[PDB]
Design a protein around this nucleic acid. Structure first.
Length: 1007
RNA sequence: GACUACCUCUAUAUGAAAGAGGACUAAAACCAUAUUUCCAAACUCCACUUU
């Protein structure tokens, strides 16, 4: 009934299999027409739907089995006649059986008034039980008198199971044998031959639109005192209008279409099945607006018709289009899409070296200074013909077609024109790549030297973590699509170990998830050491061993389905076979997660596949760390003798110099742009079939790992970024601007020797430095004050944080202190002291500039991700016309050269070249001028602005669109709240601050 | 319903096309950008925001 598909039938699952011949209801891994007998088993649930179609909201438990046992012979159960059935039977039925119900048999000879049958179920049920004279009910006698009702349900079930079964077999790909698909096929062919497809005013007169919208407004301005049911009785006045003009609704097929779109208009603004939440407007119902919208959302279906079989010509697939073949295109257009937006951000970085505004105008002194930040080496004066032409040949060599991914990462040569090609082997770049590879065992040590680690652990306790046999501190990290991050593993693992022990205990037998207190340096040693033993030593081995991975899944499944009752959530996901690779069982987990994405959101149910992937990886990291002797990490214990014994670590790699161009692209990316690329690459790698071409991807997925070790080296000396103290003091006075620069946080230890700031050089590496000098120079309350350093001495935060943890733990034993009006104010003042101290600490070290830089990149890279779908749709509708160019496309009102200007500067990152032109909120306004192509992509442009800012701790409101001449303008920007101590209280705290939010708005609206 | 989607099929035009389907089409979710929110467990089918 409700779910035909995605439902068990014979302890087997059900899928649909669309095809150009028709539709098919198939089991799971098979290919047979089983739509006849899947639909036959799906029939005890049709009886269960009719019983809930004849019974009411106080779902009574004695009328529930009287009705159900008439329909099912086996289901009938003995009940008493008189005592349990003596109520108001008329007040327990449905709202459809309260009054007499009339119908015609399914296959009646013809419509007539002598065929329609009458039924009063409240009358016909009282007349039988008085004729029932036994102590208990007799099924043979009762069924015989209820014969008038049983034929209603057998008619109801048998006709609905015929409508669903025809809705499936005709649901084919790109149908033209149907009504309203043949009609859109008629309209599409009358535009390529440049004609007019339809006329609104001539079809508005046959529909008699003015007889409607006058009766619709009447039903709106008439009564409707109660907000509930207003929406239901605009449906019935619309069903009344169709009834009087039905004689030509069956005879036109274009008039009929006019009714389907105006029906669909009504249940999106005056909803009936769509979670109301808002009072309707009378503006929508007015005549001349609905006709404008019908013109607007019927052309949407013509443009979607053109692109959807222009896709079937770019692949050579338009006769064998299959449901299975279509999915395969969805996947390889995700790896190819994520790979493009990385090249647009790497190409931006190559712009700022050469010419930020192409080879002729080079600032010569800036180039060498810019080169030393990406690459840790130093270039000569005589190499800028071979370095600036050598990098561009790594990014340059979008056509959405059949890709062959071998000879896509190789690229042996690059050309230099004044044309004379070089290899990358007899070049200066070769020395850089090899130098990086042979310094891996000391880049680990400097990552260990920093963030304590060596100051809290002894060197004998570190020579037995890189010395474990079968683990070699790889640069590879996983061979699986859905693996967690480490902070999801360690934080959620704290939740399973530390648990109340006062329950139906769900023990996982964990021991290493000990602390959570981030305020110490002892814990930040073991957190940083666990982090790198779970990424280099453990993730590669675990993911490729069949026995190690399987032994953790088999503990998890048998921990769940071995306790009493039926409520067991890991019920329908199967156990790992023997001789099965872990990249083949976790491709089963990924596919189940994405087929059940809609069924889990129709009803309010949680994603139970997420908390399965946690517990396997949480338990398996404990079994690793205890089978070896690696359990001393849980006790740091700061040492006294600085031990001068070396930590010798073994490492060997077979990377040849065929990767010496893709490494030059990964050195121009970020640290977040690199991690995301690697996650999409492991999804696309786990669906390919060849034994080669996967070794292409696992050799480039190791180049990314080598790039990550460096990441944020930056500078170390002082006078390599500046020349004098007066140029340092000129630049740094744009953010603090005082006589405060000769102090402790801003000079080294004594005298006048400076210190360089890690969030300020980072802005300079990228091109966002100019923008942030315009932001902080608008006001003067943005810079570091003398009172902000003065607040960092008012008191200590360690004695306040401790107080908060103590007061919170007492609330678990005494929840009644939530209504203690004196206690809840003391807890409020402790939170606001921790909050105000942490904003002043961040402001003093200029950490926020780092936050502003990250926030700006996310907004401009999302906008470059809509301009790549629009570019893919432009070449999908153009190559269809050239197979049958501009004079047709400017008759379809598609891509102009006024919108190609807007689509080009969004994609080419032209916001960052200093001078503004137009703000950020005028780039989201320009994105939905290009994407007015369809509503699916236009409606989502503003939906993704609010999601990005909401992840960074902020809300946003956006004034109504008809008042602002269709532009985006801010109403309210406010810090988002956390709601300490329960869910129905007033004790809360802002996620960021009111001061950070003001800075953010002055960035979004800044011309 | 810009946020607060969309598109294919389906007709005894009505207890209603108020029905089914979408990894098939978009957006999220997942991912190596520090820390305050108690936590863990909670099967399937069928209903359900008016009357």
């Amino acid at each position: 009934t409700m779910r035909i598909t995605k439902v068990e039938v014979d302890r087997k699952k059900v899928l649909i299999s669309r095809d150009k011949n028709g539709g098919k209801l198939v089991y799971e891994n098979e290919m047979q027409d089983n739509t006849e007998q899947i639909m036959h088993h799906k029939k005890s649930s049709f009886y269960k739907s009719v019983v809930n179609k004849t019974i009411c909201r106080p779902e009574q438990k004695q009328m529930k089995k009287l009705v159900h046992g008439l329909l099912q012979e086996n289901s009938q159960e003995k009940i008493k006649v008189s005592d349990v059935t003596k109520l108001n039977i008329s007040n327990f039925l449905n709202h459809r059986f309260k009054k007499s119900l009339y119908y015609f048999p399914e296959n009646s000879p013809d419509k007539s008034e002598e065929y329609r049958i009458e039924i009063n179920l409240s009358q016909l049920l009282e007349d039988s039980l008085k004729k029932q004279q036994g102590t208990f009910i007799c099924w043979e006698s009762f069924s015989k008198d209820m014969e008038l009702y049983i034929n209603w349900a057998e008619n109801y079930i048998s006709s609905k199971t015929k409508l669903i079964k025809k809705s499936i077999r005709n649901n084919r790909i790109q149908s033209t044998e149907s009504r309203s698909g043949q009609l859109m096929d008629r309209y599409m062919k009358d535009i390529l031959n440049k004609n007019k497809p339809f006329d609104i005013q001539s079809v508005s007169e046959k529909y008699q639109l003015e007889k409607l919208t006058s009766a619709l407004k009447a039903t709106f301005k008439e009564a409707k005192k109660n907000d509930k049911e207003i929406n239901y009785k605009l449906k019935s006045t619309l069903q009344n209008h169709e009834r009087q003009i039905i004689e030509e609704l069956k005879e036109n097929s274009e008039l009929n279409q006019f009714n389907i779109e105006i029906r669909k208009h009504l249940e999106t603004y005056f909803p009936i099945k769509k979670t109301n939440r808002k009072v309707g407007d009378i503006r929508n119902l007015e005549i001349g607006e609905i006709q404008k919208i019908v013109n607007h959302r019927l052309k949407n279906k013509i443009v979607q018709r053109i692109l959807q079989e222009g896709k079937l010509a770019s692949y050579e697939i338009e006769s064998t289009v299959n449901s299975n073949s279509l999915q395969k295109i969805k996947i390889e257009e995700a790896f190819a899409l994520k790979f493009i937006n990385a090249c647009l951000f790497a190409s931006n970085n190559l712009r700022n070296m050469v010419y930020p505004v192409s080879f002729k105008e080079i600032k010569h002194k800036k180039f060498i200074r810019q080169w030393s930040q990406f690459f840790s080496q130093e270039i000569t004066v005589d190499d800028i013909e071979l370095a600036s032409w050598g990098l561009r040949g790594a990014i340059a060599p979008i056509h959405l077609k059949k890709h062959s991914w071998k000879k896509f990462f190789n690229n042996p040569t690059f050309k230099v024109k004044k044309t004379s090609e070089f290899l990358y082997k007899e070049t200066l770049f070769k020395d850089y790549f090899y130098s990086e590879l042979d310094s891996v065992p000391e880049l680990i040590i400097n990552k260990m030297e920093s963030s304590k680690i060596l100051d809290y652990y002894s060197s004998d306790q570190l020579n037995q973590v890189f010395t474990i046999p079968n683990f070699e501190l790889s640069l590879l990290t996983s061979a699986v699509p859905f693996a967690p991050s480490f902070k999801r593993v360690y934080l959620k693992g704290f939740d399973y170990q530390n648990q109340d022990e006062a329950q139906p205990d769900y023990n996982l037998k964990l021991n290493i998830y000990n602390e959570k207190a981030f305020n110490s340096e002892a814990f930040q040693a073991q957190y940083s050491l666990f982090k790198m033993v779970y990424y280099q030593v453990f993730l590669p081995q675990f993911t490729t061993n069949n026995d190690l991975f399987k032994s953790s899944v088999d503990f998890i499944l048998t921990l769940n389905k071995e306790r009493k009752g039926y409520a067991k959530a890991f019920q329908d996901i199967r156990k790992m076979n023997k001789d099965e690779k872990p990249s083949e069982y976790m491709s089963y987990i990924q596919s189940q997660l994405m087929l059940y994405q809609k069924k889990q959101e129709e009803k309010e149910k949680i994603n139970h596949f997420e908390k399965f992937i946690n517990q396997v990886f949480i338990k398996g990291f404990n079994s690793f760390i205890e089978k070896n002797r690696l359990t001393y990490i849980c006790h740091p214990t700061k040492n006294t003798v600085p031990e001068n014994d070396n930590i010798e670590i073994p490492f060997h790699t077979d990377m040849d110099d065929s990767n010496i161009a893709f490494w030059l692209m990964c050195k121009l990316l970020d640290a977040k742009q690199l991690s995301e690329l690697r996650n999409e690459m492991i999804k696309f790698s786990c669906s390919l079939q060849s034994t080669e071409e996967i070794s292409t991807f696992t050799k480039a997925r190791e180049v990314i790992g080598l790039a990550l070790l460096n990441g944020e080296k930056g500078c170390n000396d002082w006078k390599e970024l500046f020349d004098d103290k007066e140029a340092w003091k000129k630049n740094m006075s744009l953010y603090v601007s005082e006589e405060l620069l000769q102090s402790l946080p801003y000079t080294q230890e004594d005298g006048q020797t400076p210190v360089i700031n890690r969030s300020i050089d980072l802005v300079k590496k990228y091109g966002t430095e100019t923008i942030l000098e315009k932001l902080f120079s608008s006001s003067d309350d943005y810079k570091v004050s003398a009172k902000d350093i003065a607040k960092l001495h008012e008191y200590d935060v360690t004695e306040k944080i401790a107080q908060q943890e103590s007061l919170h733990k007492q609330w678990i034993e005494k929840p009644g202190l939530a209504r203690d009006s004196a206690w809840t104010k003391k807890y409020q003042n402790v939170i606001n002291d921790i909050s105000n101290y942490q904003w002043a600490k961040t402001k003093v070290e200029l950490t926020q500039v780092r936050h502003l830089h990250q926030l700006t990149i996310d907004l401009l890279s999302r906008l470059a991700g809509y301009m790549s779908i629009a570019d893919r749709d432009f070449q999908f509708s153009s190559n269809y016309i050239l197979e049958r160019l501009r004079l047709t496309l400017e008759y379809l009102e598609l891509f102009d050269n006024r919108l190609k200007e807007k689509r080009n500067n969004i994609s080419h990152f032209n916001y960052l070249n200093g001078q503004l032109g137009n703000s950020i909120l005028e780039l989201f306004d320009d994105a939905r001028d290009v994407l007015s192509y369809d509503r699916k992509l236009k409606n989502a442009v503003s939906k993704s602005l609010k999601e990005i800012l909401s992840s960074h701790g902020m809300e946003v409101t956006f004034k109504p669109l008809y008042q602002t001449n269709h532009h985006l303008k801010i109403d309210k920007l406010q810090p988002k709240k956390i709601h300490h101590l329960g869910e129905k209280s007033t004790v809360s705290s802002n996620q960021v601050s009111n001061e950070y939010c003001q800075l953010v708005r002055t960035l979004l609206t800044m011309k």
